[PDB]
Design a protein around this ligand. Structure first.
Ligand SMILES: [Mg+2]
Ligand SMILES: [Mg+2]
Ligand SMILES: [Mg+2]
Ligand SMILES: [Mg+2]
Ligand SMILES: [Mg+2]
Ligand SMILES: [Mg+2]
Ligand SMILES: [Mg+2]
Ligand SMILES: [Mg+2]
Ligand SMILES: [Mg+2]
Ligand SMILES: [Mg+2]
Ligand SMILES: [Mg+2]
Ligand SMILES: [Mg+2]
Ligand SMILES: [Mg+2]
Ligand SMILES: [Mg+2]
Ligand SMILES: [Mg+2]
Ligand SMILES: [Mg+2]
Ligand SMILES: [Mg+2]
Ligand SMILES: [Mg+2]
Ligand SMILES: [Mg+2]
Ligand SMILES: [Mg+2]
Ligand SMILES: [Mg+2]
Ligand SMILES: [Mg+2]
Ligand SMILES: [Mg+2]
Ligand SMILES: [Mg+2]
Ligand SMILES: [Mg+2]
Ligand SMILES: [Mg+2]
Ligand SMILES: [Mg+2]
Ligand SMILES: [Mg+2]
Ligand SMILES: [Mg+2]
Ligand SMILES: [Mg+2]
Ligand SMILES: [Mg+2]
Ligand SMILES: [Mg+2]
Ligand SMILES: [Mg+2]
Ligand SMILES: [Mg+2]
Ligand SMILES: [Mg+2]
Ligand SMILES: [Mg+2]
Ligand SMILES: [Mg+2]
Ligand SMILES: [Mg+2]
Ligand SMILES: [Mg+2]
Ligand SMILES: [Mg+2]
Ligand SMILES: [Mg+2]
Ligand SMILES: [Mg+2]
Ligand SMILES: [Mg+2]
Ligand SMILES: [Mg+2]
Ligand SMILES: [Mg+2]
Lengths: 109, 386
RNA sequence: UUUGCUCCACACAAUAUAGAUGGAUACGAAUAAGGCGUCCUUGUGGCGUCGCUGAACCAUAGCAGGCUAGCAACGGUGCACUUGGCGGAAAGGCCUUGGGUGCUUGCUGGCGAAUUGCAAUGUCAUUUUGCGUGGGGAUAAAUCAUUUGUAUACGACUUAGAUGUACAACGGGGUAUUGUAAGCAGUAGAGUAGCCUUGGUUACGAUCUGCUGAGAUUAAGCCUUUGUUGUCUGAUUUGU
RNA sequence: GCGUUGGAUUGUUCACCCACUAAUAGGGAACGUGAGCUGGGUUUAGACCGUCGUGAGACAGGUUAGUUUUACCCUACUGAU
RNA sequence: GUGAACAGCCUCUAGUUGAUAGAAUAAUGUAGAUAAGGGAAGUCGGCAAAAUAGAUCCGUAACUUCGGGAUAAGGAUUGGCUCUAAGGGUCGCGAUCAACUU
RNA sequence: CGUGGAGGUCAGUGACGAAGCCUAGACCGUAAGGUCGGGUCGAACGGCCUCUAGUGCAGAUCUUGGUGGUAGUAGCAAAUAUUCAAAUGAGAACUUUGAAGACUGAAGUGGGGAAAGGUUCCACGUCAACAGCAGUUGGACGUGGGUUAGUCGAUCCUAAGA
RNA sequence: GAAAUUGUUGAAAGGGAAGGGCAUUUGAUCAGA
């Protein structure tokens, strides 16, 4: 929980965005992905790749994909302040389909 | 001046205040009158509302247009695994009412009921009843002394029972503990029954039987804050009404110069204690009995659980009570089934119902099939399997 | 817990007092009837007696009650022990056994008291709290934060969470909804246009057919889970 | 104790009739009730008519059109800590 | 682009992305919708809403100032695809060129 | 009884502290009021006999100024809509750049002008106030720069009219 | 450098207002002799 580690997850954005207002669905997806990375890595400092933001917004504000395959890498940072010396970086995986995939440890990068 | 057109008032002033119940487990406020000739028995039982289904049965009602004909009836299924007896309370009569003289507990309390005594179980040291259980050290002199006091006094005897939630599909994991009055004579014999049944289970069939009229005591489903139109059934105001129409137009005369308690006001709806009487038991089914949902007319080997499971509840794996119609409370809520307070002989009671068929189609939609075997038989082979 | 908590004993400090100043001294019932005593033939009995208020009964003498010497009798009373029993309406009291100790004004002596100055409540009771000295005892929770949705405007409620039939995220299965996916193929296709081995070929073609009740979605307040991955000691507060 | 209605006409209270009904009782509560509504009537200003008035104008006569404001306080009430 | 269209809807150039935000999803609201069966019984009053609606073809009453009424009323049709027919210019019946409308 | 000012007087008080102000501290008077102490303060002021008046406040929906409770309340909800990252910075929902998602949809949320405004234009610096949140940004603040005509206008003509 | 109004500190009281009069208790405070 206090080490550097990378894992690939699938997030059920469909069930996380059920019934959400249409103008708030993609922003809500961003916030749910941050909450997802915080739950899985313990890090409050979650940063999303702009490619991941593009993946979220790919179909506009309401057309969020039901499932997204994310690569979440908990890494350490050293900067002006400690401020959660661990942070998570979330990137898209760019698979053909995000169905039928389990959480895996990347083990390489 | 007078109302100018008479109409009954909206709502029942006897169910006031329309406030939230103080507990999620509705209190039994009256037990059956004790008949000290019968054997010692629980007067009530604890269960969990699983869901509703429908049955078909021949009506036995001479003189009715549907005598000896088939009728379809809604039924409520209450999951009722055996309750564990863990204690006994003695009640002495006083000029100020009933007063609990003392309570004697079982020596060993399972974690199910021990969780009831904690707000934060996981981080506690679980010391509850640790010093009490030492009262059973060598001969249980203190335990026998307390039971002797209960016999010497305590004109009313109630056992402490708790549900086994671990046997239900519920995630709660914290048992429900309640006092059930022991009817059946000889206060001494009541105490003996309690002591002998300490740490032991009492099944629902030892309390209830087929065709019996029972009362359901439960906290109704909550709906939060509600306007007068749906809380009290008042007439919707016309479309032309400025400032809204889901209101009562006149909430009072000039005098008394006060809004009166009897005027419909917006507020909490639901989550009220209700005690609804005269629900007939249609089945006292047993969890170990596969073909729970079968009848002598059906013979299909199926349990009471609908296809896909009871919606928002799960599968029935225990003993269960199927009562006719509906009872207060929503699915997964603890309910208390108590024996009737009076002897009903009305030809509606005293009717011996025999179920012909119990619906086990999915309640998650317009379920078309009673069993997976029937679905396979109708649909034939599919691509994935079958 | 920078030695915390509780109980008991003692001492010392406070704290006040809806108001101690010998004793709240226990049948029940009736009242155009009873109480007590007694007797028998035991009753709704006979006989006797009482009331006419507690104006009683008990207690009551001793430096606010001292120190002593005897007599008489085995009584009375206080204390702390102790035997056993009864009492649940709010019992927390009532009764009883035994020994020990002190007092005894039941009676008879010896000593003391002063000057608080001619009165001044002239301080004697019990209520809580704190502290210190000893002895005895026990070794938790709740809340916030996170979590659930049987709850809910917010509070509140109801769940879960320190290594497990644990929880979560995914995945699988069931259930359910729609209605047959994409792709490929076809001696299907109204025809039109070409070509020549003029009985077939090529191009275009809504659509049709097959793979295909397929594909998609399915808890967000559905059910289930021998799978994969992960999580599991942060904060605050509470003592008779 | 319990109920005492659905409608045609009329702004209407009233009235009247149709009809159901066990019954279609009478009343009060600032002729309950407009920061509850509505605004048909009445009840400003526009306009028409009839009668009256020389006239301006009048009419408890008719007719048509005519802004219905504010609660976040206190209490009361309903629920909630 | 659709379309009769400077309508509505989508887009290119250009411009803007500015309106205090975050979290929840009670009542009552404001704005937008739907509703079994009945169909104005509501109400002063059909207020509000609904229904109708484009185009092509058919058919169209009383009355009338003969102009209208009239889109009276009341019917039918409309997609896609593959075709068929008709409607032109210029040059010397042939050659060549060309756009939509029916 | 008290107030502003005046004649007289006490050769009155006072920078060793006048006046004023504060003071559940003291004294006198039935009272209007008077006197004293303590604090604060800094330049004047008082007793008595008289003179004099713009001489005494609780009010007038009084006048002017100041301040509350309401109340951290009503509310900051029309114009579809924002999001990710980096840079800058003490600080970023709001600045800049990049990326993405949208809109105006040519009767524009585009490009120019007339009236009007008057420097708002542009650069640099810059955030106390203002931009009903914010702000490192700005039509703000500070300092400067900037408007080039024989041909475009005015200028000239006449119009209603003056 | 007043008052309204306000913060802190200290003191006190407080069952649907508060304030007032007479009298005394209690606490605090104080002059006179
Ligand atoms: Mg919704
Ligand atoms: Mg009436
Ligand atoms: Mg209902
Ligand atoms: Mg209105
Ligand atoms: Mg269902
Ligand atoms: Mg009235
Ligand atoms: Mg009113
Ligand atoms: Mg009004
Ligand atoms: Mg009215
Ligand atoms: Mg009107
Ligand atoms: Mg008028
Ligand atoms: Mg005339
Ligand atoms: Mg066109
Ligand atoms: Mg309808
Ligand atoms: Mg219909
Ligand atoms: Mg109809
Ligand atoms: Mg009508
Ligand atoms: Mg009506
Ligand atoms: Mg009418
Ligand atoms: Mg209309
Ligand atoms: Mg027509
Ligand atoms: Mg006509
Ligand atoms: Mg003057
Ligand atoms: Mg001075
Ligand atoms: Mg003062
Ligand atoms: Mg000076
Ligand atoms: Mg004056
Ligand atoms: Mg004044
Ligand atoms: Mg006055
Ligand atoms: Mg005033
Ligand atoms: Mg003023
Ligand atoms: Mg607000
Ligand atoms: Mg608003
Ligand atoms: Mg907006
Ligand atoms: Mg940008
Ligand atoms: Mg638009
Ligand atoms: Mg657009
Ligand atoms: Mg500028
Ligand atoms: Mg601002
Ligand atoms: Mg600011
Ligand atoms: Mg800066
Ligand atoms: Mg400037
Ligand atoms: Mg020129
Ligand atoms: Mg100053
Ligand atoms: Mg002040």
């Amino acid at each position: 929980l206090k080490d550097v580690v990378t894992r690939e997850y699938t997030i059920n954005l469909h069930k996380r965005l059920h019934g959400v207002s249409f103008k708030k669905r993609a922003p809500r997806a961003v916030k749910e992905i941050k909450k997802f990375a915080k739950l899985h890595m313990g890090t409050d400092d979650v940063r999303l790749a702009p490619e991941l933001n593009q993946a979220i917004w790919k179909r506009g504000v309401k057309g969020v994909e039901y499932r997204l395959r994310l690569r979440i890498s908990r890494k350490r940072n050293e900067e002006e302040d400690a401020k959660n010396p661990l942070f998570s970086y979330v990137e898209p995986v760019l698979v053909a389909s995000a169905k039928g995939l389990q959480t895996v440890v990347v083990e390489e990068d | 001046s007078h109302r100018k057109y008479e109409a009954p008032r909206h709502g029942h002033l006897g169910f006031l205040p329309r406030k939230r119940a103080a507990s999620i487990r509705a209190r039994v406020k009256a037990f059956p009158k004790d008949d000290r000739s019968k054997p010692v028995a629980l007067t009530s039982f604890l269960g969990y509302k699983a869901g509703m289904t429908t049955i078909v049965r021949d009506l036995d009602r001479p003189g009715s247009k549907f005598h000896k004909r088939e009728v379809v009836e809604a039924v409520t299924v209450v999951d009722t695994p055996p309750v564990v007896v863990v204690g006994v309370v003695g009640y002495v009569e006083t000029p100020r009412g009933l007063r609990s003289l003392t309570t004697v507990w079982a020596e060993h309390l399972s974690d199910e009921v021990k969780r009831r005594f904690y707000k934060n179980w996981y981080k506690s040291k679980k010391k509850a009843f640790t010093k009490y259980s030492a009262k059973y050290a060598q001969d249980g002199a203190g335990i026998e002394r307390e039971l002797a006091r209960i016999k010497k006094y305590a004109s009313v005897v109630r056992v402490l029972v708790h549900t086994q939630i671990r046997k239900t599909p519920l995630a709660q994991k914290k048992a429900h503990l309640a006092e059930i009055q022991l009817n059946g004579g000889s206060i001494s014999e009541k105490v003996d029954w309690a002591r002998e049944h300490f740490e032991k289970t009492v099944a629902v069939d030892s309390v209830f039987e087929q065709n019996e009229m029972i009362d359901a005591i439960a906290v109704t489903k909550g709906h939060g804050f509600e306007g007068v139109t749906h809380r009290w059934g008042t007439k919707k105001l016309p479309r032309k009404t400025h400032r809204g129409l889901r209101k009562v137009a006149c909430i009072g005369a000039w005098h008394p110069a006060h809004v009166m308690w009897s005027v419909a006001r917006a507020g909490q709806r639901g989550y009220h204690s209700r005690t609804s009487i005269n629900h007939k038991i249609y089945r006292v089914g047993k969890g170990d009995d596969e073909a729970n949902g079968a009848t002598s007319f059906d013979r299909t080997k199926k349990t009471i659980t609908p296809m896909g499971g009871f919606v928002h509840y799960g599968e029935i794996k225990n003993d269960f009570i199927m009562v006719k119609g509906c009872i207060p409370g929503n699915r997964k809520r603890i309910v208390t089934l108590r024996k009737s307070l009076y002897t009903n002989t009305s030809r509606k009671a005293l009717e011996e119902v025999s179920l012909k068929w119990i619906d086990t189609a999915s309640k998650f939609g317009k379920g078309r099939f009673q069993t997976p075997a029937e679905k396979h038989a109708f649909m034939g082979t599919l691509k994935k399997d079958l």
